[PDB]
Scaffold this active site. Structure first.
Site, short mmCIF file in Angstrom:
data_model
loop_
_atom_site.label_atom_id
_atom_site.label_comp_id
_atom_site.label_asym_id
_atom_site.label_seq_id
_atom_site.Cartn_x
_atom_site.Cartn_y
_atom_site.Cartn_z
N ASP A 9 5.84 1.73 0.89
CA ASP A 9 5.69 0.93 -0.33
C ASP A 9 5.16 -0.46 0.06
OD1 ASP A 9 6.31 0.64 -3.29
OD2 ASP A 9 7.22 -1.21 -2.38
N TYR A 66 3.00 -9.25 -1.06
CA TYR A 66 3.86 -9.35 0.10
C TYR A 66 3.18 -10.00 1.29
CZ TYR A 66 6.64 -5.79 -2.55
OH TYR A 66 7.27 -5.08 -3.53
N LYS A 109 0.47 -2.20 -5.31
CA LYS A 109 0.75 -2.74 -6.63
C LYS A 109 -0.23 -3.86 -6.97
CE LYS A 109 5.60 -2.09 -5.51
NZ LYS A 109 5.62 -2.60 -4.11
N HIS A 127 2.46 -4.15 -11.05
CA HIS A 127 3.67 -4.66 -10.40
C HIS A 127 4.72 -5.17 -11.35
CE1 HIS A 127 4.87 -6.61 -6.30
NE2 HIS A 127 5.95 -6.26 -7.00
N1 NAP Z 1 8.38 -3.35 -7.63
C1 NAP Z 1 9.05 -4.53 -7.44
O1 NAP Z 1 9.15 -5.39 -8.23
C2 NAP Z 1 9.99 -4.48 -6.26
C3 NAP Z 1 10.92 -5.57 -6.14
C4 NAP Z 1 11.83 -5.61 -5.00
C5 NAP Z 1 11.71 -4.62 -3.91
N2 NAP Z 1 10.57 -3.75 -4.03
C6 NAP Z 1 10.35 -2.74 -2.95
O2 NAP Z 1 11.67 -2.18 -2.58
C7 NAP Z 1 11.83 -2.36 -1.14
C8 NAP Z 1 13.38 -2.39 -0.88
O3 NAP Z 1 13.98 -3.45 -1.58
P1 NAP Z 1 14.36 -4.88 -0.83
O4 NAP Z 1 13.36 -5.27 0.30
O5 NAP Z 1 14.57 -5.85 -1.95
O6 NAP Z 1 15.79 -4.70 -0.12
P2 NAP Z 1 16.75 -3.49 0.38
O7 NAP Z 1 15.96 -2.37 0.91
O8 NAP Z 1 17.81 -3.25 -0.70
O9 NAP Z 1 17.48 -4.31 1.58
C9 NAP Z 1 16.75 -4.84 2.66
C10 NAP Z 1 17.81 -5.49 3.59
O10 NAP Z 1 18.74 -4.51 4.09
C11 NAP Z 1 18.79 -4.62 5.52
N3 NAP Z 1 19.00 -3.27 5.94
C12 NAP Z 1 18.07 -2.19 5.89
N4 NAP Z 1 18.73 -1.03 6.33
C13 NAP Z 1 20.02 -1.42 6.77
C14 NAP Z 1 21.13 -0.64 7.39
N5 NAP Z 1 21.01 0.70 7.74
N6 NAP Z 1 22.32 -1.35 7.62
C15 NAP Z 1 22.38 -2.76 7.32
N7 NAP Z 1 21.35 -3.55 6.70
C16 NAP Z 1 20.18 -2.78 6.45
C17 NAP Z 1 17.40 -5.10 5.94
O11 NAP Z 1 17.59 -5.67 7.21
P3 NAP Z 1 16.37 -5.66 8.31
O12 NAP Z 1 15.00 -5.55 7.60
O13 NAP Z 1 16.63 -7.06 9.11
O14 NAP Z 1 16.69 -4.52 9.19
C18 NAP Z 1 17.14 -6.12 4.83
O15 NAP Z 1 17.83 -7.37 5.10
C19 NAP Z 1 11.11 -3.70 -0.92
O16 NAP Z 1 10.86 -3.94 0.47
C20 NAP Z 1 9.79 -3.39 -1.68
O17 NAP Z 1 8.96 -2.45 -0.95
C21 NAP Z 1 9.70 -3.56 -5.14
O1 LDT Z 2 8.23 -8.65 -7.02
C1 LDT Z 2 8.57 -8.05 -5.84
O2 LDT Z 2 8.22 -6.94 -5.56
C2 LDT Z 2 9.67 -8.67 -4.99
O3 LDT Z 2 9.75 -10.02 -5.44
C3 LDT Z 2 8.71 -10.87 -5.06
C4 LDT Z 2 7.81 -10.58 -3.90
C5 LDT Z 2 6.83 -11.62 -3.48
F1 LDT Z 2 6.13 -11.27 -2.42
C6 LDT Z 2 6.68 -12.94 -4.17
C7 LDT Z 2 7.60 -13.22 -5.30
C8 LDT Z 2 8.57 -12.17 -5.73
C9 LDT Z 2 9.49 -12.28 -6.88
S1 LDT Z 2 9.83 -13.87 -7.38
N1 LDT Z 2 9.74 -11.19 -7.75
C10 LDT Z 2 10.59 -11.68 -8.80
C11 LDT Z 2 9.70 -11.65 -10.08
C12 LDT Z 2 8.22 -11.71 -9.98
C13 LDT Z 2 7.40 -11.71 -11.25
C14 LDT Z 2 8.22 -11.51 -12.48
BR1 LDT Z 2 7.17 -11.39 -14.08
C15 LDT Z 2 9.66 -11.41 -12.67
C16 LDT Z 2 10.39 -11.45 -11.39
F2 LDT Z 2 11.70 -11.33 -11.37
#
Ligand code: NAP
Ligand code: LDT
EC number: 1.1.1.21
Length: 316
Positions: free
Chosen positions: A44, A49, A78, A111
């Site tokens: 993803d 990012y 995205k 996104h």
């Molecule tokens: N569409 C959107 O708006 C949206 C928004 C937010 C997230 N996303 C996508 O969702 C992905 C996942 O969400 P997220 O990055 O917010 O966080 P997450 O996957 O809920 O958590 C990431 C955190 O968990 C730690 N971690 C990973 N596996 C672990 C394990 N087995 N034990 C302990 N800690 C662990 C990582 O540490 P380390 O990396 O230091 O190992 C990092 O600090 C994002 O990277 C992105 O691709 C999309």
């Molecule tokens: O968005 C990601 O995937 C992870 O988050 C982010 C990832 C980035 F690389 C830069 C900012 C954000 C933020 S601030 N996302 C929050 C956000 C952005 C826009 C709107 Br509309 C509402 C909202 F809640």
């Protein structure tokens, strides 16, 4: 269970992928390499990012090494909010393709539902800190996304952070050609999203759960926010299965027929997070985890709450 889920375009999407938000450019290349070695086939990404070039270097090396073939990988990116204008969508997709070094994406998502003023800033703000909106509506952005399928740049299109009224708007679009394949939303035991998931699934849209571990590295974390990973009730369920809490939190959305995309740059944790196919949570464990819902959202942003298309004013 099955390791892939069928999308409305006939493609199979792996139910476990690797997230890349917050993965530093100097570590994400190694992370993705290790993930591919261990067995991940879904990554993803997003332009915002700021690490797509480095992801791309990892993907190319593993294709060149013949560890994997392109058709076995499922790469998602995205469209950022500053590119919602009809004429900017293609260019944004091409930039991503160039950075990732690919000739097509398997899935390209809008996104967020909100369009921002185009420009070099990802969050263009006005003099009082409100995000400057663009006058584009989501249906016109969708039409532009559909043209990318017709042009062969992307195999499937979808949405992210859309509430149910916003999904309905797309499904009722005059002249809709391709339905959204996926809605990628925040989902974990503190924000279980039952209503939205049931809506989406009823319409044949696959839901991908982001921040499944509660995003403990999020930049705006406060010292006394809830921590899923340290919730003692979740620890007890993990202990009962001889798994880690992370493994339980990853398995949870899988048993709800969701795709899940945990992020890690730590090789041991990348491998640990993949070992979730050899155990099952009981019906009882599932219902108990669902009962921990508190409508607590990691991903929300005050500067955008005045936008007319901000998604979180609705119940779901
Ligand atoms: N569409 C959107 O708006 C949206 C928004 C937010 C997230 N996303 C996508 O969702 C992905 C996942 O969400 P997220 O990055 O917010 O966080 P997450 O996957 O809920 O958590 C990431 C955190 O968990 C730690 N971690 C990973 N596996 C672990 C394990 N087995 N034990 C302990 N800690 C662990 C990582 O540490 P380390 O990396 O230091 O190992 C990092 O600090 C994002 O990277 C992105 O691709 C999309
Ligand atoms: O968005 C990601 O995937 C992870 O988050 C982010 C990832 C980035 F690389 C830069 C900012 C954000 C933020 S601030 N996302 C929050 C956000 C952005 C826009 C709107 Br509309 C509402 C909202 F809640």
């Amino acid at each position: 269970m099955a390791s892939r889920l069928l999308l409305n375009n006939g493609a199979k999407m792996p139910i476990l992928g690797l997230g890349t938000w917050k993965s530093p450019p100097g570590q994400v290349t190694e992370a993705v390499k290790v993930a591919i070695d261990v067995g991940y086939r879904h990554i993803d990404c997003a332009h915002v990012y700021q690490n797509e070039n480095e992801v791309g270097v990892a993907i190319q090396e593993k294709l060149r090494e013949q560890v994997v073939k392109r058709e076995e990988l499922f790469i998602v990116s995205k469209l950022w909010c500053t590119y919602h204008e009809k004429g900017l969508v293609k260019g944004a997709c091409q930039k991503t393709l160039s950075d990732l070094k690919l000739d097509y994406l398997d899935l390209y998502l809008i996104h967020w539902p909100t369009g921002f003023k185009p420009g070099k800033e990802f969050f263009p703000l006005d003099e009082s800190g409100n995000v400057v909106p663009s006058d584009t509506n989501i249906l016109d952005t969708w039409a532009a996304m559909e043209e990318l399928v017709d042009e062969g740049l992307v195999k499937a299109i979808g949405i992210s952070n859309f509430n149910h009224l916003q999904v309905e708007m797309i499904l009722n679009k005059p002249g809709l050609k391709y339905k959204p394949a996926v809605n990628q939303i925040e989902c974990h035991p503190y924000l279980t999203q039952e209503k939205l998931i049931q809506y989406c699934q009823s319409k044949g849209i696959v839901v991908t759960a982001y921040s499944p571990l509660g995003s403990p590295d999020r930049p705006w974390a406060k010292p006394e926010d809830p921590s899923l990973l340290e919730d003692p009730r979740i620890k007890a369920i993990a202990a009962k299965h001889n798994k880690t809490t992370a493994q339980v939190l990853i398995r949870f959305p899988m048993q709800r027929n969701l795709v899940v995309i945990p992020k890690s740059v730590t090789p041991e944790r990348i491998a640990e997070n993949f070992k979730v196919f050899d155990f099952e949570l009981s019906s009882q464990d599932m219902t108990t985890l669902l009962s921990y819902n508190r409508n607590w959202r990691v991903c929300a942003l005050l500067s955008c709450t005045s936008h007319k298309d901000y998604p979180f004013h609705e119940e779901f």
